[PDB]
Copies of this chain bind each other. A is one copy, B any other.
Amino acid sequence: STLFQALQAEKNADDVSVHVKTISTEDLPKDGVLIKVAYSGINYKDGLAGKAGGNIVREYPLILGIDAAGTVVSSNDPRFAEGDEVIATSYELGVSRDGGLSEYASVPGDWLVPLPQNLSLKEAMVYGTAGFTAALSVHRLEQNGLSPEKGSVLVTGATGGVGGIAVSMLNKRGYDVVASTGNREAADYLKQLGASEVISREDVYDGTLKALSKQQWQGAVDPVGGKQLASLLSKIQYGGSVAVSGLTGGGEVPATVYPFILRGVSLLGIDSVYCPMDVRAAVWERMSSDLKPDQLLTIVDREVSLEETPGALKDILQNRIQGRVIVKL
């Protein structure tokens, strides 16, 4: 109907600046459900979406997104009605379509998952994509035989979004959680999240690439998939599983194959971007009861506002945010 404040990235010949422009509903896509967002949208993927050079967004007249949980204002789709609390994440939001780092977002009804009862519009955005990735990781690991009795579970990339919540989700489930960080003195935070043991990054990758190097952990959530991941698989127990979804500290994995063939481990790829609806909705249902931790609000580092986002976008992608940041609109 009228105008709103929006976080829009913009290209200047060869350079991207990221501005806070005032946009109307008329400029929003005419093929989606109009929703008052009110909450969040800032992740590591959005940090790359703001910085020039990162391989994410092509057409640049684009409002940054990835993550949105608000209320339906106007819907030309019978599947959704006025007053419906919905979560809009992933797919094309913030990649090729105007996302949720802004007041009001026109997102198709096919990507909208109704807000679970045991979660608020804030609580779902405390998770975000980093929370959904962590939950989908646990969901996929448990399909292959992850259970809290066959051994302790190691979570790399702790302190971060995916790893931090994955520690809390495993702790609520009942797993003995082992947290891995490159930052010391962070032990009195990961233990607060629910980690039984806090180890260094060297405790996972120091001896450098061995074929079969002693069983240590049952499962693994690994948002740090590189040379560390190749050494991680070598330390996994029999019938174990490792969930990837991470580009931190490496892109190439010099994996052997002996942990797979001889010790029956399974490397599982986690994609939050194009996850099917029936899987997506069922995961969000687990994030409300079965995998909803007593912590949740502890992984919150800053309650940032729409004005404080341009500076907070580069805080992630530099290890300045411990946990996750939420936007309020």
Residue of B264, B271, B276 near A262 (CB, 8 A) is B271
**Which stretch (A15-23, A114-122, A184-192, A200-208) binds chain B?**
A114-122
| Known A-B contacts A82-B214, A238-B78; A263 and B257 likewise in contact (beta carbons under 8 Å) | no
Write 13 A-B pairs (CB below 8 A) sorted by A numbering: A31-B31, A78-B238, A81-B214, A82-B214, A225-B261, A251-B258, A252-B255, A254-B255, A261-B271, A264-B271, A265-B269, A267-B268, A276-B277
Known contacts A78-B274, A114-B149, A238-B78, A251 near B245 by CB under 8 Å: no
Q: Does A99 contact B (CB under 8 A)?
A: no
The 8 Å CB contact of A270, one of B214, B250, B261, B267, is B261
A77 close to chain B: CB less than 8 A: yes
A118 to B252, CA, bound (A): 39
Taking CB atoms, residues of chain B closer than 8 Å to A110 are 108, 110-111, 277
Please state if B81 and A216 are interface contacts (CB–CB under 8 Å): yes
Q: Does A295 reach chain B (CB closer than 8 Å)?
A: no
Taking a contact as CB atoms closer than 8 A, the residue among B114, B150, B176, B278 that contacts A150 in the complex is B114
Most buried by B among A81, A144, A211: A81
In the bound complex, CA of A269 to CA of B261 (Å): 5
Contact of A149 (CB < 8 Å), options: B115, B238, B270: B115
CB of A3 within 8 A of chain B? no
Contact A268 B269 (CB under 8 A): no
Please measure, in the bound complex, the distance between the C-alpha atom of A84 and the C-alpha atom of B275, giving whole angstroms: 18
Contact indicator B229/A257 (Cβ below 8 Å): yes
* B261 & A117 in contact (Cβ 8 Å cutoff): no
Q: How many residues of A contact B (CB 8 A)?
A: 71
Chain B positions within 8 Å of A140 at CB level: 266
Q: Which of B79, B250, B259 contacts A269 (CB 8 A)?
A: B259
A259: chain B residues within 8 A (beta carbon):
269
Q: Is the CB of B251 within 8 A of A260?
A: no
The A interface, classified by DSSP as helix, strand, loop or mixed, is loop
Do A274 and B225 touch (CB < 8 A)? no
Q: Is A180 in the interface zone, CB < 8 Å from B?
A: no
Contact status of A257 and B225, CB under 8 A, knowing A110-B111, A111-B110: yes
- Contact between chains at B251 and A116 (CB < 8 Å): no
Judge whether A151 is part of the interface by a CB distance below 8 angstroms: yes
Residues of B within 8 A of A175 (CB): 117
Complex: how many Å from CA A268 to CA B265? 7
Contacts of A150 in B (CB 8 A): 84, 114
Q: Kindly report which residue of chain B lies nearest to residue A136, judged by CB atoms.
A: B264
Contact with B along A47-81 (1 / 0, CB 8 A): 00000000000000000000000000000011111
Query: Is A237 positioned at the interface, with any CB of B under 8 Å from its CB?
Result: yes
Determine how close the nearest CB of chain B comes to the CB of A97; give it in whole angstroms.
8
